mmCIF file of C-alpha atoms in Angstrom:
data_model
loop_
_atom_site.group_PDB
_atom_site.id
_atom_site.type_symbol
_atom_site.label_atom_id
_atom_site.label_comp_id
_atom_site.label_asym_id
_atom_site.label_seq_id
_atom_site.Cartn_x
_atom_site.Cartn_y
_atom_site.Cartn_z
ATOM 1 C CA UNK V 1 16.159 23.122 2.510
ATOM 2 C CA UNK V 2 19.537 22.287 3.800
ATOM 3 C CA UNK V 3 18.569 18.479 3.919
ATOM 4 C CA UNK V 4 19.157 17.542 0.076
ATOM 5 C CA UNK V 5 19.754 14.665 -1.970
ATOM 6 C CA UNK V 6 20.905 14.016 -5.217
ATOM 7 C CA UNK V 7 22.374 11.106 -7.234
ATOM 8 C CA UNK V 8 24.771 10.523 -10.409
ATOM 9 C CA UNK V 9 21.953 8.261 -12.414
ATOM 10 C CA UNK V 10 18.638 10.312 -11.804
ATOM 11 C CA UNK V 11 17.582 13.790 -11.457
ATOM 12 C CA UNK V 12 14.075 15.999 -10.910
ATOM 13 C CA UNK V 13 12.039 15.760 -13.403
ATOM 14 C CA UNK V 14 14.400 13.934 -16.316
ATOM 15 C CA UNK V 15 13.113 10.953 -17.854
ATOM 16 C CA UNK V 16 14.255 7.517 -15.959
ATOM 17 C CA UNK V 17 16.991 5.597 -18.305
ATOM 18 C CA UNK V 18 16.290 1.676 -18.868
ATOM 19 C CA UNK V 19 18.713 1.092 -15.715
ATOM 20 C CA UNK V 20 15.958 1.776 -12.840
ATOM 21 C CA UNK V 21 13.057 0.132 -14.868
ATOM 22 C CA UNK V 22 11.471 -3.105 -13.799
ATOM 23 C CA UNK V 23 11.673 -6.206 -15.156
ATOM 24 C CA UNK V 24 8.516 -7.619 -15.586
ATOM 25 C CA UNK V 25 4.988 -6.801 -16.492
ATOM 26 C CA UNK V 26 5.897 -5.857 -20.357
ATOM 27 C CA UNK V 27 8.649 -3.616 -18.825
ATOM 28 C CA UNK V 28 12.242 -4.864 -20.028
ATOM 29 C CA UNK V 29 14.407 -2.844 -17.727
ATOM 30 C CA UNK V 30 17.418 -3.009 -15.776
ATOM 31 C CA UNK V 31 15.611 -2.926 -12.460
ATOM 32 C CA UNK V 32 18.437 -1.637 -10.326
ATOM 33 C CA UNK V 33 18.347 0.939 -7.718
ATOM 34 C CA UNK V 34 20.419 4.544 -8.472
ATOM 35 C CA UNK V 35 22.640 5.869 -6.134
ATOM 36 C CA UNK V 36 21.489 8.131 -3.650
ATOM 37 C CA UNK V 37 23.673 11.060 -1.880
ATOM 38 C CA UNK V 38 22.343 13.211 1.177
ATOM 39 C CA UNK V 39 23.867 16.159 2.412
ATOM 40 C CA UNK V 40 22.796 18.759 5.206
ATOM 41 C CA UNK V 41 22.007 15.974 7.603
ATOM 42 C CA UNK V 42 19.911 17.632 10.244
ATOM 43 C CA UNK V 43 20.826 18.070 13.994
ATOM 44 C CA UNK V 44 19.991 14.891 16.143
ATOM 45 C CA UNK V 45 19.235 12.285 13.418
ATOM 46 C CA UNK V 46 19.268 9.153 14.479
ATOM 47 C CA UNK V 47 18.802 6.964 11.001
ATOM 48 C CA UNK V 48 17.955 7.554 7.627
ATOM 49 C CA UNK V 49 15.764 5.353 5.360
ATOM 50 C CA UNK V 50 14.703 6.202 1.885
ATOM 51 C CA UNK V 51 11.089 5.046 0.527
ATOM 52 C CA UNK V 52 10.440 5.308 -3.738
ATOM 53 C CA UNK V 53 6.675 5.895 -4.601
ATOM 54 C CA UNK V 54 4.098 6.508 -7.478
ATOM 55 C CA UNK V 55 1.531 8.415 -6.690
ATOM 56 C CA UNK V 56 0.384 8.349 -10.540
ATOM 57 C CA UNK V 57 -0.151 4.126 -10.547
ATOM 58 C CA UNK V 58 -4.279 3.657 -11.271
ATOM 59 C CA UNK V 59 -4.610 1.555 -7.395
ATOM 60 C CA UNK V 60 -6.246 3.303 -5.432
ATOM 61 C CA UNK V 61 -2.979 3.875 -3.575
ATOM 62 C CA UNK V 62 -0.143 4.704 -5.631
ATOM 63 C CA UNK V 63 2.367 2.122 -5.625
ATOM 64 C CA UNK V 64 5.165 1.851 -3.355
ATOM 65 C CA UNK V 65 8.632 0.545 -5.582
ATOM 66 C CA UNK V 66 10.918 0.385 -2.504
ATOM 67 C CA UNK V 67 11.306 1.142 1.115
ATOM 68 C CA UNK V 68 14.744 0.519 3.470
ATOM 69 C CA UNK V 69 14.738 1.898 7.068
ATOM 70 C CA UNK V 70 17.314 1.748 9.692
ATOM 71 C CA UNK V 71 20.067 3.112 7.513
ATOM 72 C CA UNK V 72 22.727 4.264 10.192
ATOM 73 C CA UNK V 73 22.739 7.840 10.897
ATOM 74 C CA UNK V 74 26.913 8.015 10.242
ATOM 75 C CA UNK V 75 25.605 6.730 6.456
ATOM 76 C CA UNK V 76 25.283 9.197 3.891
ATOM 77 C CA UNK V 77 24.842 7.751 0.691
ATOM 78 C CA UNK V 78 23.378 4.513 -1.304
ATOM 79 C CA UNK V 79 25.566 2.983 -3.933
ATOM 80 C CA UNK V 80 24.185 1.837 -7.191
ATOM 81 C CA UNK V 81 22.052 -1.423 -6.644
ATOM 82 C CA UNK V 82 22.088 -1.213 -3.036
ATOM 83 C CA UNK V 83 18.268 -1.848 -3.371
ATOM 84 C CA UNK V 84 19.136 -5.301 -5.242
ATOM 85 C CA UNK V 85 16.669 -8.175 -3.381
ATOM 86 C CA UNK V 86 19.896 -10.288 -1.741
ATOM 87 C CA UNK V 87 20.525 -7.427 0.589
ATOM 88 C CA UNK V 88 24.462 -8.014 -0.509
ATOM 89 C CA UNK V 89 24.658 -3.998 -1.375
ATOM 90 C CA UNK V 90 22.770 -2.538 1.890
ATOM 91 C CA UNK V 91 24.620 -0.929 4.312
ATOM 92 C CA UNK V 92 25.126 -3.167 7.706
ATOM 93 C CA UNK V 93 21.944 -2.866 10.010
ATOM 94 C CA UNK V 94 19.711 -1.770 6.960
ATOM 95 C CA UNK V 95 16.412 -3.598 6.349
ATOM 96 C CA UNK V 96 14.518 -3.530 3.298
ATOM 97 C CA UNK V 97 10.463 -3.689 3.471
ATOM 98 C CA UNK V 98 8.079 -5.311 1.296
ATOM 99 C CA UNK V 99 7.296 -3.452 -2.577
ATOM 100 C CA UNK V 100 3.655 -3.892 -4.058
ATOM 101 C CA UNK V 101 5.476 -6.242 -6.580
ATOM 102 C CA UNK V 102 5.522 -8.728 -3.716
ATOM 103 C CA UNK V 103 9.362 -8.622 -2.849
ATOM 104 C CA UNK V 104 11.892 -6.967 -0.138
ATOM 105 C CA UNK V 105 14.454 -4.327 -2.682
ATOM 106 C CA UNK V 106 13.934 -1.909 -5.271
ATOM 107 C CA UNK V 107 11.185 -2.478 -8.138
ATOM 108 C CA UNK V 108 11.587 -0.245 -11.254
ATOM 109 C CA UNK V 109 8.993 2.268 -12.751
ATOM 110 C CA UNK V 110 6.579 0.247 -15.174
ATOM 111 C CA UNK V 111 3.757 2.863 -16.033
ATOM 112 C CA UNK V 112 0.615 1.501 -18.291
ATOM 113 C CA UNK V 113 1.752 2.659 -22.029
ATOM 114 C CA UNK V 114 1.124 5.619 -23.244
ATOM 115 C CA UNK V 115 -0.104 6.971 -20.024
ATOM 116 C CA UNK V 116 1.742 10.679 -19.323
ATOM 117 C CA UNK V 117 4.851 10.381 -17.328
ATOM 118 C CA UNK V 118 4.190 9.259 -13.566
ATOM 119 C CA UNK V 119 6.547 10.883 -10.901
ATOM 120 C CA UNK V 120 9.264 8.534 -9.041
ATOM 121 C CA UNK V 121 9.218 10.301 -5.703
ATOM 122 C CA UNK V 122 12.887 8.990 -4.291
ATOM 123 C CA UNK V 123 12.967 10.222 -0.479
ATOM 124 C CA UNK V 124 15.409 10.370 2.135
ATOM 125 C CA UNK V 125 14.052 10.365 5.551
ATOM 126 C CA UNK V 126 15.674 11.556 8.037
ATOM 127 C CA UNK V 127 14.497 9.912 11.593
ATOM 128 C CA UNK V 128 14.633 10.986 15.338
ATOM 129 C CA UNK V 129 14.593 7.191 16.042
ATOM 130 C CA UNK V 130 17.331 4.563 16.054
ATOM 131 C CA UNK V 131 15.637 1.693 14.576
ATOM 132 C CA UNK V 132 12.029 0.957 13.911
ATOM 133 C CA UNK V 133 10.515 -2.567 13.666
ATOM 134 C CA UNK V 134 10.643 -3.875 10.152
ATOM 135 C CA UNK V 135 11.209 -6.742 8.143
ATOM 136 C CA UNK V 136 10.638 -8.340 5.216
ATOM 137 C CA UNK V 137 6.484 -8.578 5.841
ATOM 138 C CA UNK V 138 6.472 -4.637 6.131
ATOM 139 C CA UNK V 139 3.606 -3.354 3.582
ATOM 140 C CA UNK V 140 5.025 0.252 2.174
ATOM 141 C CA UNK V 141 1.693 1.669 4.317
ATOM 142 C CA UNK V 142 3.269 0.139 7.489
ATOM 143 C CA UNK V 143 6.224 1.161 6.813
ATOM 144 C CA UNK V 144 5.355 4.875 6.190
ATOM 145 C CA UNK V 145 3.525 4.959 8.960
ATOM 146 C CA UNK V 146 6.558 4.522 11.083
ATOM 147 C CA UNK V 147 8.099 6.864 9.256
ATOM 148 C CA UNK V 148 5.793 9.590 9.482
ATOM 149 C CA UNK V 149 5.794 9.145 13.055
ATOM 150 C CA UNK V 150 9.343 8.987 13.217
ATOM 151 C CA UNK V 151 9.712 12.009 10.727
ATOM 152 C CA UNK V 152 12.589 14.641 11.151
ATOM 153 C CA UNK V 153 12.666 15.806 7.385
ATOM 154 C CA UNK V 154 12.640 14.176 3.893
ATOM 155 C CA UNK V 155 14.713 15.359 1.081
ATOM 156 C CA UNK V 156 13.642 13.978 -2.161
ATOM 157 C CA UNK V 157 14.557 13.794 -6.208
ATOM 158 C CA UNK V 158 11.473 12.864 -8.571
ATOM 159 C CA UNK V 159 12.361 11.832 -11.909
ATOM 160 C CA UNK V 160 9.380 10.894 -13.980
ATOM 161 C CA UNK V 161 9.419 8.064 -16.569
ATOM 162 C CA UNK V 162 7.136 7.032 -19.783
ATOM 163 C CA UNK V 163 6.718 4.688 -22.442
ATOM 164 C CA UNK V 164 7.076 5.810 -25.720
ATOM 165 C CA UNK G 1 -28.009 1.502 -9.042
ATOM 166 C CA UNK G 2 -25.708 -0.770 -8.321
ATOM 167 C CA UNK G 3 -25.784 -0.908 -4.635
ATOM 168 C CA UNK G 4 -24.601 -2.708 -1.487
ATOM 169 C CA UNK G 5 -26.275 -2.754 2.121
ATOM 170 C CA UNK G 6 -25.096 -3.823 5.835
ATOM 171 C CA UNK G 7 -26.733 -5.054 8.883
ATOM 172 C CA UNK G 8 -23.871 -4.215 10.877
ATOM 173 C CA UNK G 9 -21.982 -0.779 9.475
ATOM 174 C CA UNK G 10 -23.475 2.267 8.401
ATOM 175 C CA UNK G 11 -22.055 5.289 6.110
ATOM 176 C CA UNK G 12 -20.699 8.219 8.848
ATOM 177 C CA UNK G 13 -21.815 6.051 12.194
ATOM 178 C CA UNK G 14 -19.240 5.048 14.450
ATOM 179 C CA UNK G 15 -17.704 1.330 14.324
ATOM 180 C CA UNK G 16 -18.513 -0.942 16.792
ATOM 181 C CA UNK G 17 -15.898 -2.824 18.699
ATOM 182 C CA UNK G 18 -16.382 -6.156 16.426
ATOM 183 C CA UNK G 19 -14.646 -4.504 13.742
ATOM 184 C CA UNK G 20 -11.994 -2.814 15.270
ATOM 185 C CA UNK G 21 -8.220 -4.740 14.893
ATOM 186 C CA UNK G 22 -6.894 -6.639 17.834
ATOM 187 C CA UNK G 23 -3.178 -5.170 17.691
ATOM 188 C CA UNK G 24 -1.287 -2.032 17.596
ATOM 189 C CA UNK G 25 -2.915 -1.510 20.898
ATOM 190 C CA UNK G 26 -6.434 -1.776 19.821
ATOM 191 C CA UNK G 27 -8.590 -4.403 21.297
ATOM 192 C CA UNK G 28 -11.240 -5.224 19.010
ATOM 193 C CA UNK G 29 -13.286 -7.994 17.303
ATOM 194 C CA UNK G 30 -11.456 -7.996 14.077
ATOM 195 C CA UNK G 31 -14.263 -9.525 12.448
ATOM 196 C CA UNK G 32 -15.462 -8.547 9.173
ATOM 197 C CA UNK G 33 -19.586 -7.068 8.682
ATOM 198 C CA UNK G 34 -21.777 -8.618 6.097
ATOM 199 C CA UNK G 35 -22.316 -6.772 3.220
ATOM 200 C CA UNK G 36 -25.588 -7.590 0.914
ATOM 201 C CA UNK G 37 -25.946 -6.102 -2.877
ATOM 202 C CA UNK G 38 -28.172 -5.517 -5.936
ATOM 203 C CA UNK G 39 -28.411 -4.014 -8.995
ATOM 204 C CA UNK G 40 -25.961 -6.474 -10.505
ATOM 205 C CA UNK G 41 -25.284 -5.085 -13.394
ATOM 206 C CA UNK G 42 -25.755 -6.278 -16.902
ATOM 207 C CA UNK G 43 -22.080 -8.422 -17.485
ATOM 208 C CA UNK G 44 -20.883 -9.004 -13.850
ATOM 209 C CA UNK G 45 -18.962 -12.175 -13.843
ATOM 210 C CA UNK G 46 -17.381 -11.873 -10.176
ATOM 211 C CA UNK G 47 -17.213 -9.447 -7.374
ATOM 212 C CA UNK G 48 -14.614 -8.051 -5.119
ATOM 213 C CA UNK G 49 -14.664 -6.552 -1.583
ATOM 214 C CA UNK G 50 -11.982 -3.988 -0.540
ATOM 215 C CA UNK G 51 -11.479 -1.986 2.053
ATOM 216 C CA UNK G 52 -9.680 1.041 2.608
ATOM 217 C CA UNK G 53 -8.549 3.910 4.781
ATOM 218 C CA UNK G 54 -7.572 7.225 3.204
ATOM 219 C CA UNK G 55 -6.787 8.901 6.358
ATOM 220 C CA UNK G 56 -4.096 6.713 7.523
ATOM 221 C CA UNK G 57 -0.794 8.685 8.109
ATOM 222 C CA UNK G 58 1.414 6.664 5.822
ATOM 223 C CA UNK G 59 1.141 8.444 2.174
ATOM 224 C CA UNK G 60 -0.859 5.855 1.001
ATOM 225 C CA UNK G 61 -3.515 5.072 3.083
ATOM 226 C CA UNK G 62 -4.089 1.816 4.662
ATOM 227 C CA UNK G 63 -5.377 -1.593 2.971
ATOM 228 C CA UNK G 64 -7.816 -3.263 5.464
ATOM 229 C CA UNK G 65 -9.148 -5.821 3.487
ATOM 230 C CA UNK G 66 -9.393 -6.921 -0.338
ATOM 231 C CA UNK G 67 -11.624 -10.234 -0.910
ATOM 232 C CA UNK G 68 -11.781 -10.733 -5.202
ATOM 233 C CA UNK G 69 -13.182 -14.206 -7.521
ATOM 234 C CA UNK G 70 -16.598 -13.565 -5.701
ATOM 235 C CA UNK G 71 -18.397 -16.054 -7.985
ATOM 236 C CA UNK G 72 -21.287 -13.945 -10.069
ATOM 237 C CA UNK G 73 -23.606 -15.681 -8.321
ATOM 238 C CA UNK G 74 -23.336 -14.761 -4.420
ATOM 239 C CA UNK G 75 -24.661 -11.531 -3.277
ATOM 240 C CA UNK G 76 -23.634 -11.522 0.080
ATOM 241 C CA UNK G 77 -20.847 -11.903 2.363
ATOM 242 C CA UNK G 78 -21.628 -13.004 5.991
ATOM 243 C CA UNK G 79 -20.114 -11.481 8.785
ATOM 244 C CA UNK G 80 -16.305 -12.696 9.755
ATOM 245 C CA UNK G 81 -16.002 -13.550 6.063
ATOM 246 C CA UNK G 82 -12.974 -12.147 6.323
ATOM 247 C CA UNK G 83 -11.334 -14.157 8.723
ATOM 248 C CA UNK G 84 -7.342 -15.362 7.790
ATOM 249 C CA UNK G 85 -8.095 -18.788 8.350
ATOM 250 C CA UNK G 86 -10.295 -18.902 5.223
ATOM 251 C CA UNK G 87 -13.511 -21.002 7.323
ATOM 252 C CA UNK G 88 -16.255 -18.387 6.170
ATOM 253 C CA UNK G 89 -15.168 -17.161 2.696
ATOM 254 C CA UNK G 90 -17.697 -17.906 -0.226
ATOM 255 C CA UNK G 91 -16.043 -20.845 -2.538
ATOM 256 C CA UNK G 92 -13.757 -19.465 -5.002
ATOM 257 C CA UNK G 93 -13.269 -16.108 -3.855
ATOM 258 C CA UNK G 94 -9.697 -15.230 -2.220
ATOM 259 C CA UNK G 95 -8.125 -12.970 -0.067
ATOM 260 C CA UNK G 96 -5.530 -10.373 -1.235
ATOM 261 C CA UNK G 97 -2.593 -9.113 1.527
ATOM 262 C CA UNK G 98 -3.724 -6.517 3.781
ATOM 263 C CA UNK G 99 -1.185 -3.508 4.959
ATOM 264 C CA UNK G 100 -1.059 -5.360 8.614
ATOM 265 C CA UNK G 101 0.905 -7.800 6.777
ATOM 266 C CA UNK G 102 -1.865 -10.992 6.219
ATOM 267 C CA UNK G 103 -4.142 -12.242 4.014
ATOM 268 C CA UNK G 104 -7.487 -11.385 5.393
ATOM 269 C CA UNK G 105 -10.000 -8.615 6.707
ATOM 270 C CA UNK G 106 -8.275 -6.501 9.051
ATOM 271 C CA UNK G 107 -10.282 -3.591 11.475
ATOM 272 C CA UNK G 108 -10.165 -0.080 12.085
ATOM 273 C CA UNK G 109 -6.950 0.788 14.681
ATOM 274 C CA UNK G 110 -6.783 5.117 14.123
ATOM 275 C CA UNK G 111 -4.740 6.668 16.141
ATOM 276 C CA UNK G 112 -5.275 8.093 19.611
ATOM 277 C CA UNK G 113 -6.990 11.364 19.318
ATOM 278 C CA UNK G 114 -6.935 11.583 15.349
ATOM 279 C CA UNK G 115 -9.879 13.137 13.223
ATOM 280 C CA UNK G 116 -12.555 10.184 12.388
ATOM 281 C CA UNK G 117 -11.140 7.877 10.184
ATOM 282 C CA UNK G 118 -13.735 6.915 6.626
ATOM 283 C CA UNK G 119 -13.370 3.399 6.366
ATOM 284 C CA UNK G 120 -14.443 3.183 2.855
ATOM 285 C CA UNK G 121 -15.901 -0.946 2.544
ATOM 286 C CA UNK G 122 -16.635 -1.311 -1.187
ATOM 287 C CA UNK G 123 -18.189 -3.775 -3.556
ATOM 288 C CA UNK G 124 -16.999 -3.760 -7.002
ATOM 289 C CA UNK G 125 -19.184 -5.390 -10.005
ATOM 290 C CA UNK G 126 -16.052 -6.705 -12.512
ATOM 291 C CA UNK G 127 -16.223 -8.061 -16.345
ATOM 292 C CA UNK G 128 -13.887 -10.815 -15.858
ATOM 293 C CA UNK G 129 -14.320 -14.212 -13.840
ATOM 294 C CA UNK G 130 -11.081 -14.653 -12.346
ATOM 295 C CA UNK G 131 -8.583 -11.729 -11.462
ATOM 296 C CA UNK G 132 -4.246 -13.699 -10.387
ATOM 297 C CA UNK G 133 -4.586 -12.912 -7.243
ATOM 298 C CA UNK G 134 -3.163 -14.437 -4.278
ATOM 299 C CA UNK G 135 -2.411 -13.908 -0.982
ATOM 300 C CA UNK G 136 0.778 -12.243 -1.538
ATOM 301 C CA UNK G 137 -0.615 -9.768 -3.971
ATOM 302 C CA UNK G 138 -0.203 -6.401 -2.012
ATOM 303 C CA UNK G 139 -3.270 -4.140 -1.948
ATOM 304 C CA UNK G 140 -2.251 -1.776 -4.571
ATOM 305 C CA UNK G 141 -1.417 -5.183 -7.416
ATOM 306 C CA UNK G 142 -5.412 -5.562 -6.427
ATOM 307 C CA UNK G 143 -6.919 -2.643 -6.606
ATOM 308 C CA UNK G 144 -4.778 -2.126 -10.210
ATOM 309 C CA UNK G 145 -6.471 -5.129 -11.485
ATOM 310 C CA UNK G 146 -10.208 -4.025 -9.898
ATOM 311 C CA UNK G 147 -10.153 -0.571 -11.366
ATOM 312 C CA UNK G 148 -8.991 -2.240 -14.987
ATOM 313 C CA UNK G 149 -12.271 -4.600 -14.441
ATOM 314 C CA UNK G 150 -14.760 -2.137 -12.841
ATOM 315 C CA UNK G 151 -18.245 -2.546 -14.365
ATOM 316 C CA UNK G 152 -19.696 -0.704 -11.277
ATOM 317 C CA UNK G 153 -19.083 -0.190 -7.557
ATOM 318 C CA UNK G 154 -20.766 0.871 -4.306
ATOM 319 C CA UNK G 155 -19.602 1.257 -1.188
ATOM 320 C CA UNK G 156 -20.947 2.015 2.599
ATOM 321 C CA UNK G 157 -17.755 4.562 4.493
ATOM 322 C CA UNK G 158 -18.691 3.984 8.570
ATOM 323 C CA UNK G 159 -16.093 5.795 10.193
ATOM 324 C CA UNK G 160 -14.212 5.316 13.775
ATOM 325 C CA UNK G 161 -12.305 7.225 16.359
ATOM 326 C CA UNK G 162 -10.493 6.682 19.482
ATOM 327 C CA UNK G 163 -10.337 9.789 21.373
ATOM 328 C CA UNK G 164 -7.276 10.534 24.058
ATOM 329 C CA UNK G 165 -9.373 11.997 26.222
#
């Protein structure tokens, strides 16, 4: 309850803008991460890391759009675009894990057309561990795994996004 | 009718060590079980193996294994198929990424004292000959481009545990 996040780009249930939507696979979009703002950190955190998934995408497993752990605990918000592939926008000792569009940052929403809105779920995980192992090779599975484990509480936004 | 048989795994029996991973503090065989089907259906022109774990704790289960571009004309998979190196996989066919991070069949590893774990090993019966895959394309990229194919599936779900005590 007292662990929240919000940003200035994105909000619960509101309709993503072209900004944060990929680019690629039909989907013309700006493909840039939105800020992200926490407040309430709870007692004894010791990192953050914030994971973006689909649960709506027709997989089999959802689809995991970003994942960055080892966000230090005195961090408590994500600028614009920190999710950008060059890692020249995370905060220091951040690591970024592998998307299911094959690359370490943030990939967009790109639903199947005129499928109803899928739901963005943005979290911000708040960990009772330092560091956990991850890199570049992380699958979103492994990395939510470790998470999970590592789990403290999650504060989330989930906008929702469509093609006309 | 469409259907898919095993000499080594069988739906709700317990794995045997030879498919169990060899990491994360498991000590297994990693090797993949044969798998034979029928009841191709009418306009099959490839199959695909995948393999999956609901029950992982990671909010999206866990990709052991995905195996598409089985050439319409092989009905079986021998066992270790599946191995990274790429020595017993049917010509043509190629591996997708698993969620341990490599491009090839990867075992059962639940952890210590969970509930049973339903690996769910299915064969898929697909319309098209060729799916882009590679061996970066992440579990989820295959399994969008498998259910957009589907003619048919079946599948055999053995499942495994590791107790504490």
């Amino acid at each position: 309850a007292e662990f929240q996040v919000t940003s200035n780009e994105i909000k619960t249930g509101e309709q993503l803008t072209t900004s944060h939507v990929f680019s690629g696979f039909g989907c013309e979009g700006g493909n840039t991460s939105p800020s992200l703002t926490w407040s309430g950190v709870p007692e004894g955190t010791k990192s953050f890391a914030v994971t973006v998934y689909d649960p709506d995408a027709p997989t089999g497993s959802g689809w995991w759009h970003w994942t960055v752990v080892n966000i230090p605990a005195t961090v408590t918000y994500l600028p614009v675009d920190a999710g950008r592939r060059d890692g020249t926008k995370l905060p220091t000792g951040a690591v970024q894990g592998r998307n299911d569009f094959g690359y370490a940052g943030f990939g967009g929403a790109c639903p199947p057309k005129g499928d109803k809105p899928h739901h963005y779920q943005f979290k911000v995980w708040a960990l009772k561990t330092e560091k956990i192992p991850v890199d570049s090779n992380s699958s979103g599975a492994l990395v939510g795994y470790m998470l999970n484990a590592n789990k403290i509480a999650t504060a989330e936004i989930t906008p929702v996004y469509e093609i006309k």
